[PDB]
mmCIF file with all atom_site columns, C-alpha atoms and ligand atoms in Angstrom:
data_model
loop_
_atom_site.group_PDB
_atom_site.id
_atom_site.type_symbol
_atom_site.label_atom_id
_atom_site.label_alt_id
_atom_site.label_comp_id
_atom_site.label_asym_id
_atom_site.label_entity_id
_atom_site.label_seq_id
_atom_site.pdbx_PDB_ins_code
_atom_site.Cartn_x
_atom_site.Cartn_y
_atom_site.Cartn_z
_atom_site.occupancy
_atom_site.B_iso_or_equiv
_atom_site.pdbx_formal_charge
_atom_site.auth_seq_id
_atom_site.auth_comp_id
_atom_site.auth_asym_id
_atom_site.auth_atom_id
_atom_site.pdbx_PDB_model_num
ATOM   1   C  CA  . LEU A 1 1   ? 115.533 105.475 99.262  1.00 0.00 ? 7   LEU A CA  1
ATOM   2   C  CA  . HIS A 1 2   ? 114.234 102.151 97.819  1.00 0.00 ? 8   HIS A CA  1
ATOM   3   C  CA  . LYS A 1 3   ? 111.102 100.188 96.871  1.00 0.00 ? 9   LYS A CA  1
ATOM   4   C  CA  . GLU A 1 4   ? 109.694 97.233  98.842  1.00 0.00 ? 10  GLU A CA  1
ATOM   5   C  CA  . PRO A 1 5   ? 106.888 94.889  97.852  1.00 0.00 ? 11  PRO A CA  1
ATOM   6   C  CA  . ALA A 1 6   ? 103.499 94.977  99.423  1.00 0.00 ? 12  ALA A CA  1
ATOM   7   C  CA  . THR A 1 7   ? 99.970  93.730  98.167  1.00 0.00 ? 13  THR A CA  1
ATOM   8   C  CA  . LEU A 1 8   ? 96.613  95.611  98.502  1.00 0.00 ? 14  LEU A CA  1
ATOM   9   C  CA  . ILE A 1 9   ? 94.562  94.515  101.311 1.00 0.00 ? 15  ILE A CA  1
ATOM   10  C  CA  . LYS A 1 10  ? 91.899  97.289  101.025 1.00 0.00 ? 16  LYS A CA  1
ATOM   11  C  CA  . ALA A 1 11  ? 91.422  100.925 99.579  1.00 0.00 ? 17  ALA A CA  1
ATOM   12  C  CA  . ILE A 1 12  ? 90.496  103.210 102.552 1.00 0.00 ? 18  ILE A CA  1
ATOM   13  C  CA  . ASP A 1 13  ? 90.431  106.872 101.484 1.00 0.00 ? 19  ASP A CA  1
ATOM   14  C  CA  . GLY A 1 14  ? 92.436  109.454 99.438  1.00 0.00 ? 20  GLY A CA  1
ATOM   15  C  CA  . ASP A 1 15  ? 95.652  109.228 101.509 1.00 0.00 ? 21  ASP A CA  1
ATOM   16  C  CA  . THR A 1 16  ? 95.264  106.035 103.377 1.00 0.00 ? 22  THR A CA  1
ATOM   17  C  CA  . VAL A 1 17  ? 95.211  102.440 102.153 1.00 0.00 ? 23  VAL A CA  1
ATOM   18  C  CA  . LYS A 1 18  ? 95.666  98.887  103.936 1.00 0.00 ? 24  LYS A CA  1
ATOM   19  C  CA  . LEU A 1 19  ? 98.509  96.935  102.615 1.00 0.00 ? 25  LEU A CA  1
ATOM   20  C  CA  . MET A 1 20  ? 100.345 93.650  103.584 1.00 0.00 ? 26  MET A CA  1
ATOM   21  C  CA  . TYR A 1 21  ? 103.866 94.620  104.142 1.00 0.00 ? 27  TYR A CA  1
ATOM   22  C  CA  . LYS A 1 22  ? 106.504 92.046  105.279 1.00 0.00 ? 28  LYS A CA  1
ATOM   23  C  CA  . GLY A 1 23  ? 103.533 89.496  105.578 1.00 0.00 ? 29  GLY A CA  1
ATOM   24  C  CA  . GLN A 1 24  ? 101.604 91.780  108.310 1.00 0.00 ? 30  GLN A CA  1
ATOM   25  C  CA  . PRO A 1 25  ? 98.484  93.899  107.525 1.00 0.00 ? 31  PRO A CA  1
ATOM   26  C  CA  . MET A 1 26  ? 99.184  97.630  107.931 1.00 0.00 ? 32  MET A CA  1
ATOM   27  C  CA  . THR A 1 27  ? 97.443  100.948 107.357 1.00 0.00 ? 33  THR A CA  1
ATOM   28  C  CA  . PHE A 1 28  ? 99.679  103.183 105.352 1.00 0.00 ? 34  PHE A CA  1
ATOM   29  C  CA  . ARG A 1 29  ? 99.282  107.160 105.439 1.00 0.00 ? 35  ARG A CA  1
ATOM   30  C  CA  . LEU A 1 30  ? 100.690 108.712 102.232 1.00 0.00 ? 36  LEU A CA  1
ATOM   31  C  CA  . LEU A 1 31  ? 103.659 111.024 103.037 1.00 0.00 ? 37  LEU A CA  1
ATOM   32  C  CA  . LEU A 1 32  ? 103.670 114.823 102.368 1.00 0.00 ? 38  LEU A CA  1
ATOM   33  C  CA  . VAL A 1 33  ? 100.030 114.933 101.010 1.00 0.00 ? 39  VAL A CA  1
ATOM   34  C  CA  . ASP A 1 34  ? 96.560  115.790 102.470 1.00 0.00 ? 40  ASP A CA  1
ATOM   35  C  CA  . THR A 1 35  ? 93.450  114.550 100.699 1.00 0.00 ? 41  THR A CA  1
ATOM   36  C  CA  . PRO A 1 36  ? 90.045  116.018 101.722 1.00 0.00 ? 42  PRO A CA  1
ATOM   37  C  CA  . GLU A 1 37  ? 88.057  113.675 104.121 1.00 0.00 ? 43  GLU A CA  1
ATOM   38  C  CA  . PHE A 1 38  ? 85.289  111.541 102.272 1.00 0.00 ? 44  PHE A CA  1
ATOM   39  C  CA  . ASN A 1 39  ? 82.625  113.802 103.738 1.00 0.00 ? 45  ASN A CA  1
ATOM   40  C  CA  . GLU A 1 40  ? 84.480  117.015 102.462 1.00 0.00 ? 46  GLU A CA  1
ATOM   41  C  CA  . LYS A 1 41  ? 84.407  118.635 98.990  1.00 0.00 ? 47  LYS A CA  1
ATOM   42  C  CA  . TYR A 1 42  ? 86.734  116.441 96.548  1.00 0.00 ? 48  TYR A CA  1
ATOM   43  C  CA  . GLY A 1 43  ? 86.946  113.704 99.356  1.00 0.00 ? 49  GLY A CA  1
ATOM   44  C  CA  . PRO A 1 44  ? 85.019  111.165 97.393  1.00 0.00 ? 50  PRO A CA  1
ATOM   45  C  CA  . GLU A 1 45  ? 86.915  111.899 94.118  1.00 0.00 ? 51  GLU A CA  1
ATOM   46  C  CA  . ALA A 1 46  ? 90.325  111.496 96.024  1.00 0.00 ? 52  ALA A CA  1
ATOM   47  C  CA  . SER A 1 47  ? 89.013  108.217 97.484  1.00 0.00 ? 53  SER A CA  1
ATOM   48  C  CA  . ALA A 1 48  ? 88.003  106.894 93.992  1.00 0.00 ? 54  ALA A CA  1
ATOM   49  C  CA  . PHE A 1 49  ? 91.284  108.074 92.491  1.00 0.00 ? 55  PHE A CA  1
ATOM   50  C  CA  . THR A 1 50  ? 93.561  106.308 95.026  1.00 0.00 ? 56  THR A CA  1
ATOM   51  C  CA  . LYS A 1 51  ? 91.135  103.333 95.080  1.00 0.00 ? 57  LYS A CA  1
ATOM   52  C  CA  . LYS A 1 52  ? 91.183  102.771 91.262  1.00 0.00 ? 58  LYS A CA  1
ATOM   53  C  CA  . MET A 1 53  ? 95.055  103.418 91.155  1.00 0.00 ? 59  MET A CA  1
ATOM   54  C  CA  . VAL A 1 54  ? 95.811  100.845 93.753  1.00 0.00 ? 60  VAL A CA  1
ATOM   55  C  CA  . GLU A 1 55  ? 93.180  98.305  92.830  1.00 0.00 ? 61  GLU A CA  1
ATOM   56  C  CA  . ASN A 1 56  ? 94.159  98.422  89.051  1.00 0.00 ? 62  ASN A CA  1
ATOM   57  C  CA  . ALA A 1 57  ? 97.953  97.939  89.912  1.00 0.00 ? 63  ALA A CA  1
ATOM   58  C  CA  . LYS A 1 58  ? 99.546  94.526  89.298  1.00 0.00 ? 64  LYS A CA  1
ATOM   59  C  CA  . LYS A 1 59  ? 102.423 95.687  91.463  1.00 0.00 ? 65  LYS A CA  1
ATOM   60  C  CA  . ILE A 1 60  ? 102.222 97.836  94.772  1.00 0.00 ? 66  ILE A CA  1
ATOM   61  C  CA  . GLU A 1 61  ? 105.453 99.088  96.226  1.00 0.00 ? 67  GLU A CA  1
ATOM   62  C  CA  . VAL A 1 62  ? 106.270 101.104 99.473  1.00 0.00 ? 68  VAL A CA  1
ATOM   63  C  CA  . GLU A 1 63  ? 109.112 103.367 99.874  1.00 0.00 ? 69  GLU A CA  1
ATOM   64  C  CA  . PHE A 1 64  ? 110.033 104.591 103.178 1.00 0.00 ? 70  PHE A CA  1
ATOM   65  C  CA  . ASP A 1 65  ? 111.720 107.866 103.638 1.00 0.00 ? 71  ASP A CA  1
ATOM   66  C  CA  . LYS A 1 66  ? 114.778 108.430 105.962 1.00 0.00 ? 72  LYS A CA  1
ATOM   67  C  CA  . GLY A 1 67  ? 112.639 109.174 109.165 1.00 0.00 ? 73  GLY A CA  1
ATOM   68  C  CA  . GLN A 1 68  ? 109.849 107.997 111.321 1.00 0.00 ? 74  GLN A CA  1
ATOM   69  C  CA  . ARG A 1 69  ? 108.269 105.004 109.445 1.00 0.00 ? 75  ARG A CA  1
ATOM   70  C  CA  . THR A 1 70  ? 105.104 104.746 111.664 1.00 0.00 ? 76  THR A CA  1
ATOM   71  C  CA  . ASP A 1 71  ? 103.191 107.830 112.945 1.00 0.00 ? 77  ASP A CA  1
ATOM   72  C  CA  . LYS A 1 72  ? 101.580 108.246 116.340 1.00 0.00 ? 78  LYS A CA  1
ATOM   73  C  CA  . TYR A 1 73  ? 98.409  106.315 115.327 1.00 0.00 ? 79  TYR A CA  1
ATOM   74  C  CA  . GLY A 1 74  ? 100.545 103.311 114.209 1.00 0.00 ? 80  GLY A CA  1
ATOM   75  C  CA  . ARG A 1 75  ? 100.008 103.893 110.424 1.00 0.00 ? 81  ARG A CA  1
ATOM   76  C  CA  . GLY A 1 76  ? 103.009 103.264 108.095 1.00 0.00 ? 82  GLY A CA  1
ATOM   77  C  CA  . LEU A 1 77  ? 104.486 106.422 106.594 1.00 0.00 ? 83  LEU A CA  1
ATOM   78  C  CA  . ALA A 1 78  ? 105.534 105.880 102.905 1.00 0.00 ? 84  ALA A CA  1
ATOM   79  C  CA  . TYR A 1 79  ? 105.434 106.778 99.374  1.00 0.00 ? 85  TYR A CA  1
ATOM   80  C  CA  . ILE A 1 80  ? 103.155 104.260 97.646  1.00 0.00 ? 86  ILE A CA  1
ATOM   81  C  CA  . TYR A 1 81  ? 103.642 103.180 93.866  1.00 0.00 ? 87  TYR A CA  1
ATOM   82  C  CA  . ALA A 1 82  ? 101.300 101.433 91.563  1.00 0.00 ? 88  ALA A CA  1
ATOM   83  C  CA  . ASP A 1 83  ? 103.093 99.821  88.747  1.00 0.00 ? 89  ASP A CA  1
ATOM   84  C  CA  . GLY A 1 84  ? 106.016 102.319 89.191  1.00 0.00 ? 90  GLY A CA  1
ATOM   85  C  CA  . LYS A 1 85  ? 103.823 105.420 89.482  1.00 0.00 ? 91  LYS A CA  1
ATOM   86  C  CA  . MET A 1 86  ? 103.700 107.404 92.764  1.00 0.00 ? 92  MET A CA  1
ATOM   87  C  CA  . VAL A 1 87  ? 100.129 107.592 94.174  1.00 0.00 ? 93  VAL A CA  1
ATOM   88  C  CA  . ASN A 1 88  ? 101.153 110.575 96.307  1.00 0.00 ? 94  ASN A CA  1
ATOM   89  C  CA  . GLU A 1 89  ? 102.442 112.592 93.278  1.00 0.00 ? 95  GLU A CA  1
ATOM   90  C  CA  . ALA A 1 90  ? 99.497  111.557 90.991  1.00 0.00 ? 96  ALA A CA  1
ATOM   91  C  CA  . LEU A 1 91  ? 96.987  112.939 93.718  1.00 0.00 ? 97  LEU A CA  1
ATOM   92  C  CA  . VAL A 1 92  ? 98.934  116.207 93.834  1.00 0.00 ? 98  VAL A CA  1
ATOM   93  C  CA  . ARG A 1 93  ? 99.198  116.358 90.100  1.00 0.00 ? 99  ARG A CA  1
ATOM   94  C  CA  . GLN A 1 94  ? 95.344  115.850 89.693  1.00 0.00 ? 100 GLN A CA  1
ATOM   95  C  CA  . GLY A 1 95  ? 94.625  118.545 92.284  1.00 0.00 ? 101 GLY A CA  1
ATOM   96  C  CA  . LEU A 1 96  ? 92.975  115.823 94.541  1.00 0.00 ? 102 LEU A CA  1
ATOM   97  C  CA  . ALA A 1 97  ? 95.685  116.299 97.362  1.00 0.00 ? 103 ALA A CA  1
ATOM   98  C  CA  . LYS A 1 98  ? 97.557  119.257 98.696  1.00 0.00 ? 104 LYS A CA  1
ATOM   99  C  CA  . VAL A 1 99  ? 101.320 119.026 99.552  1.00 0.00 ? 105 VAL A CA  1
ATOM   100 C  CA  . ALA A 1 100 ? 101.265 118.963 103.443 1.00 0.00 ? 106 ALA A CA  1
ATOM   101 C  CA  . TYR A 1 101 ? 102.805 117.438 106.704 1.00 0.00 ? 107 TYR A CA  1
ATOM   102 C  CA  . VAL A 1 102 ? 106.260 118.276 105.439 1.00 0.00 ? 108 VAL A CA  1
ATOM   103 C  CA  . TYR A 1 103 ? 108.494 117.143 108.500 1.00 0.00 ? 109 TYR A CA  1
ATOM   104 C  CA  . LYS A 1 104 ? 112.301 117.520 108.174 1.00 0.00 ? 110 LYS A CA  1
ATOM   105 C  CA  . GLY A 1 105 ? 113.983 114.063 107.724 1.00 0.00 ? 111 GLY A CA  1
ATOM   106 C  CA  . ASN A 1 106 ? 110.824 112.562 105.926 1.00 0.00 ? 112 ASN A CA  1
ATOM   107 C  CA  . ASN A 1 107 ? 110.741 114.952 103.037 1.00 0.00 ? 113 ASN A CA  1
ATOM   108 C  CA  . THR A 1 108 ? 112.898 113.444 100.112 1.00 0.00 ? 114 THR A CA  1
ATOM   109 C  CA  . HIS A 1 109 ? 110.120 113.872 97.455  1.00 0.00 ? 115 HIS A CA  1
ATOM   110 C  CA  . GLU A 1 110 ? 109.054 117.291 98.689  1.00 0.00 ? 116 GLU A CA  1
ATOM   111 C  CA  . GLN A 1 111 ? 110.123 119.395 95.588  1.00 0.00 ? 117 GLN A CA  1
ATOM   112 C  CA  . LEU A 1 112 ? 108.925 116.566 93.181  1.00 0.00 ? 118 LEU A CA  1
ATOM   113 C  CA  . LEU A 1 113 ? 105.331 117.036 94.652  1.00 0.00 ? 119 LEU A CA  1
ATOM   114 C  CA  . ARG A 1 114 ? 105.553 120.887 94.948  1.00 0.00 ? 120 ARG A CA  1
ATOM   115 C  CA  . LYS A 1 115 ? 106.442 120.857 91.143  1.00 0.00 ? 121 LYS A CA  1
ATOM   116 C  CA  . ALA A 1 116 ? 103.234 118.648 90.719  1.00 0.00 ? 122 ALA A CA  1
ATOM   117 C  CA  . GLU A 1 117 ? 101.148 121.102 92.730  1.00 0.00 ? 123 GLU A CA  1
ATOM   118 C  CA  . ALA A 1 118 ? 102.320 124.066 90.895  1.00 0.00 ? 124 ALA A CA  1
ATOM   119 C  CA  . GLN A 1 119 ? 101.114 122.456 87.559  1.00 0.00 ? 125 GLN A CA  1
ATOM   120 C  CA  . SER A 1 120 ? 97.702  121.232 89.187  1.00 0.00 ? 126 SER A CA  1
ATOM   121 C  CA  . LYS A 1 121 ? 97.154  124.929 90.397  1.00 0.00 ? 127 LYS A CA  1
ATOM   122 C  CA  . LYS A 1 122 ? 98.232  126.270 86.950  1.00 0.00 ? 128 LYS A CA  1
ATOM   123 C  CA  . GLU A 1 123 ? 95.516  124.011 85.351  1.00 0.00 ? 129 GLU A CA  1
ATOM   124 C  CA  . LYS A 1 124 ? 92.982  124.979 88.035  1.00 0.00 ? 130 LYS A CA  1
ATOM   125 C  CA  . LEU A 1 125 ? 92.288  121.228 88.685  1.00 0.00 ? 131 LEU A CA  1
ATOM   126 C  CA  . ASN A 1 126 ? 89.769  119.981 91.217  1.00 0.00 ? 132 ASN A CA  1
ATOM   127 C  CA  . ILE A 1 127 ? 90.698  121.648 94.557  1.00 0.00 ? 133 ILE A CA  1
ATOM   128 C  CA  . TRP A 1 128 ? 92.287  124.526 92.627  1.00 0.00 ? 134 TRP A CA  1
ATOM   129 C  CA  . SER A 1 129 ? 89.164  125.100 90.374  1.00 0.00 ? 135 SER A CA  1
HETATM 130 C  C1  . THP B 2 .   ? 101.210 112.681 106.913 1.00 0.00 ? 201 THP B C1  1
HETATM 131 C  C2  . THP B 2 .   ? 101.619 112.605 108.332 1.00 0.00 ? 201 THP B C2  1
HETATM 132 C  C3  . THP B 2 .   ? 100.604 112.612 109.308 1.00 0.00 ? 201 THP B C3  1
HETATM 133 N  N1  . THP B 2 .   ? 100.824 112.630 110.605 1.00 0.00 ? 201 THP B N1  1
HETATM 134 C  C4  . THP B 2 .   ? 99.893  112.745 111.670 1.00 0.00 ? 201 THP B C4  1
HETATM 135 C  C5  . THP B 2 .   ? 99.752  114.263 111.952 1.00 0.00 ? 201 THP B C5  1
HETATM 136 C  C6  . THP B 2 .   ? 98.431  114.567 112.094 1.00 0.00 ? 201 THP B C6  1
HETATM 137 O  O1  . THP B 2 .   ? 98.054  114.650 113.533 1.00 0.00 ? 201 THP B O1  1
HETATM 138 P  P1  . THP B 2 .   ? 96.594  114.891 114.201 1.00 0.00 ? 201 THP B P1  1
HETATM 139 O  O2  . THP B 2 .   ? 95.757  113.738 114.070 1.00 0.00 ? 201 THP B O2  1
HETATM 140 O  O3  . THP B 2 .   ? 97.037  115.255 115.573 1.00 0.00 ? 201 THP B O3  1
HETATM 141 O  O4  . THP B 2 .   ? 96.015  115.992 113.448 1.00 0.00 ? 201 THP B O4  1
HETATM 142 C  C7  . THP B 2 .   ? 97.652  113.494 111.554 1.00 0.00 ? 201 THP B C7  1
HETATM 143 C  C8  . THP B 2 .   ? 97.073  113.800 109.983 1.00 0.00 ? 201 THP B C8  1
HETATM 144 O  O5  . THP B 2 .   ? 96.684  112.696 109.346 1.00 0.00 ? 201 THP B O5  1
HETATM 145 P  P2  . THP B 2 .   ? 95.211  112.641 108.544 1.00 0.00 ? 201 THP B P2  1
HETATM 146 O  O6  . THP B 2 .   ? 95.298  113.775 107.558 1.00 0.00 ? 201 THP B O6  1
HETATM 147 O  O7  . THP B 2 .   ? 95.134  111.408 107.973 1.00 0.00 ? 201 THP B O7  1
HETATM 148 O  O8  . THP B 2 .   ? 94.146  112.993 109.678 1.00 0.00 ? 201 THP B O8  1
HETATM 149 O  O9  . THP B 2 .   ? 98.579  112.457 111.222 1.00 0.00 ? 201 THP B O9  1
HETATM 150 C  C9  . THP B 2 .   ? 102.177 112.507 111.077 1.00 0.00 ? 201 THP B C9  1
HETATM 151 O  O10 . THP B 2 .   ? 102.489 112.334 112.127 1.00 0.00 ? 201 THP B O10 1
HETATM 152 N  N2  . THP B 2 .   ? 103.247 112.297 110.145 1.00 0.00 ? 201 THP B N2  1
HETATM 153 C  C10 . THP B 2 .   ? 102.917 112.413 108.856 1.00 0.00 ? 201 THP B C10 1
HETATM 154 O  O11 . THP B 2 .   ? 103.867 112.294 107.998 1.00 0.00 ? 201 THP B O11 1
HETATM 155 CA CA1 . CA  B 3 .   ? 93.257  113.510 105.006 1.00 0.00 ? 202 CA  B CA1 1
#
């Protein structure tokens, strides 16, 4: 897998963000995670978390997996990095997302995120409190 450049257009919620990718605006859905919706418990904190992560980053990168690169809603499916740190993994580590929507062939970082979820649960963070 490899990292490609992108720039923030707009923070949306915990697991979606608007980025410019090869010069085109695009909504990205974070692979392998599920944040609560804004109106749900920890939704606002998930949105705040992702928003600050991507807004403070001097360098956003997108990393496609080996499978489907856009979902049925036209959203990009990727791992998103903010100054080399994976937003997907950071949300799970902080208990602001659950490992989820694990589909065969788009699951390269599954065990890395499950390891983060195990530590978050151990610490009873946020969703696991
Ligand atoms: C994360 C992810 C979601 N999706 C689709 C499945 C879900 O379908 P449904 O809309 O039919 O429930 C939806 C979940 O996204 P959200 O959690 O953003 O709603 O997005 C994929 O198809 N591939 C993926 O990798
Ligand atoms: Ca969600």
